[PDB]
């Protein structure tokens, strides 16, 4: 057979191979000897020149102009500029085309069917902390559409020789607060305790619900953070009810229509872009299953199966299914009601392997993290968890980053 | 270096040191990890040596008793034999040893807090597939003990130089027949349609129902395989009702006690025992999501979506995991009405869990395919999708082999 890997579907008894992989210049962490797949995160010079080299061939290919000449001046351009300042910098559309990429290669996104549709912000003007709050802004403004979802990404100047990094601190946007108190517990939402802390600690005045959204924390190069305050007529949110049990609309749960990652750093041809949020709309199961059930988030579960009149003494009932099941609908219907996109997680999975599908097709492979694009419900219920998946880091990437602090 | 393992529902890291032991690769590169791929791409008297000493090291090791007159008299045994036939031969205890390690590092296995107790019967001194079809008999009779199940394993004699191995043709002891109708489609287990259609060729006549316990295929060294009919009354089955639906069990649904794979190799200080049944008992997943719910499988959720008055018309109402979680909860119900043990996918993951934590004290990790103990459904409902795990492979070892035709 040819030696790359052999891909098979169960369901359809279908096989692939994978011969994209064959373009990773990057490792992971898996060995021969001890697979570590199932880890969130794994334990310049003539670099720059090879990485940057590599992008522009990406670029030059994507429009159709290999080996050109407009092809060959680029690349001396970029080298003359790495030969005098240690760096380069990239065309408007050379932008464009690595932010689309960066998503399309990204390992854990089950959502890249929509990869050619991303609304682009160039921000590399910014030069303020107050600058980026206006970006920010805008972006939920452009983004969240009053309930109809744009997918969107802004990205703030680069990385830089000597010059401190754009950051924003918190990790998306949009977050609750989580507040600590003495009875051990958590107001809020566990997760994001410590940015919560450290919004207080830059001189916020907390507020004290299990649902206050955050004030950004920007940094601008060299300068210690800023507060700001979100407009909360620009912060669209979705109370939360039930089609048929009339009281889960009183238990008072809400959430927020607009997901934005806004701690992952961006690389593209070598440059590293370390304040770039992008938001895209949610899929029914982060919201319904992860964030209101997990046990280290609103934990919600028994609360609601009490309330379904549940057997919650034995596990056996499938108590904690029940609940889980009648929440994500809730999720669902809600969003439905006030007209805010959102996907299921059947039809989502069911796009992502048209999306899987299409990139055979078209490169050859697709980088994917089966535990990470697995619905943490109803996995064999659909089709993904019958799909083998190989994974692997493509370039232009989203990578995580070390926090500011 | 030595991986650190988080849990994210409860903050804890830790470091598998235990992984260092293992000698065989798995399908992963640092370029890219292949964790999820079901099978291996791929499926001397010097090497059998070593795996045969680090083996009688294991044995002595585990009875307090390295250096004692005994290990080394007994690795002088060994010596000898191989330096002599190619080969050797296990003593009794040393094999109900290696059994037993066998299961304890079964990465795809969620039940190994049940590792120390399992029943081990030597079949080594068996000429024929008549012996083994007694074999097979005594086995499934102790295994299912009227209902109150018992973990069992049947070893038949070693693979050996040049002549064909014992195999059982079947998969598991107990499948239900797959036929193919004329119109494409199966009829029965359709995960079973090849084995069918081997034993009609080989003298069987069928029968013609969705539920049909197959005959046994046995094969002696060199010899066509022979077809024997397991008596109907050592096989144990549950009819499917459901607690509170009247009319799911006129649905006619049934399952079997007794989940005993047949088709896999047992290797132990490097001799391979080609035909080494072995049995426990069923999470409840495996039956109620996976056989009845696959798409191809059993297929039943449109069946029941539609007897439970659900909208089959659009993904947003769920109906799926709706129906999926009556069906585990008649899987449940029925099992535990007929008294015949079953675990269900919380409680084993609860022990999975005290598994991995006397595993780490124990040994210093424990190897674990995260993919295959996160059940099929309600994933982060169980404190498995929280818990990082390492996967790779230690000797002894259950591996998969070729099919024997
Ligand atoms: C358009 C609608 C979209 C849907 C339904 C979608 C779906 C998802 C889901 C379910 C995850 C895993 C979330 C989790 O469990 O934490 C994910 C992760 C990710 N998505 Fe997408 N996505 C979409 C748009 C986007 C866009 C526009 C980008 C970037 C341009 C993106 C990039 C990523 C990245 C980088 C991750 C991994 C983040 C991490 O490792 O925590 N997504 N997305
Ligand atoms: C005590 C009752 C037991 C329970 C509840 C249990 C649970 C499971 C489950 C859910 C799987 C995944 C199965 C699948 O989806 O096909 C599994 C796999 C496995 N189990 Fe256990 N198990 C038990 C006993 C045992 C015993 C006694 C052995 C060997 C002596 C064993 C060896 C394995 C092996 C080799 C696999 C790999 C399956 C494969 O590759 O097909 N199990 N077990
Ligand atoms: C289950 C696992 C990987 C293992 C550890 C963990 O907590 C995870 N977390 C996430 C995951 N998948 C997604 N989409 N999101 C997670 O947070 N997969
Ligand atoms: C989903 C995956 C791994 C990927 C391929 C596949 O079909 C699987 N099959 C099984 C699995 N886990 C279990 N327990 N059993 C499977 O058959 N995990
Ligand atoms: N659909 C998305 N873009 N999700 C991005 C991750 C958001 C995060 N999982 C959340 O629930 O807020
Ligand atoms: N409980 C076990 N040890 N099972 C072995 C696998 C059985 C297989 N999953 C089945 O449904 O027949
Ligand atoms: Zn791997």
Known sequence: ???????????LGSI?????????????????????????????????????????????????????????????????????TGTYHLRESELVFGAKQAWRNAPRCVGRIQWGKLQVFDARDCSSAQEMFTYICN????????????????????RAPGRGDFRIWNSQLVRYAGYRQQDGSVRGDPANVEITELCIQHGWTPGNGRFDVLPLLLQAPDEAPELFVLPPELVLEVPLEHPTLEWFAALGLRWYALPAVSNMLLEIGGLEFSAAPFSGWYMSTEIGTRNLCDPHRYNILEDVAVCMDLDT????????????????????????????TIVDHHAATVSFMKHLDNE???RGGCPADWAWIVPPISGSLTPVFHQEMVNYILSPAFRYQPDPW
């Open 313 to 340: 003494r034995t596990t056996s009932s499938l108590w904690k299914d029940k609940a889980a099941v009648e929440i994500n609908l809730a999720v669902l219907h809600s969003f439905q009601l006030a007209k805010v």
């Open 1 to 11: 057979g040819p030696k790359f890997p052999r891909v098979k579907n169960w369901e």
């Open 16 to 84: 692939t191979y994978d011969t994209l992989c064959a373009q990773s210049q990057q490792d992971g962490p898996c060995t021969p000897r001890r697979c570590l797949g199932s880890l969130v995160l794994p334990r310049p010079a003539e670099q720059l020149l090879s990485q940057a080299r590599d992008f522009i061939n990406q670029y030059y290919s994507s429009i159709k102009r290999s080996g050109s000449q407009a092809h060959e001046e680029r690349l001396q351009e970029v080298e003359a500029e790495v030969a005098s």
């Open 139 to 158: 972006h939920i403004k452009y983004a969240t559409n009053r309930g109809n979802l744009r997918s969107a990404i802004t990205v703030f100047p680069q």
């Open 360 to 362: 055979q097709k078209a």
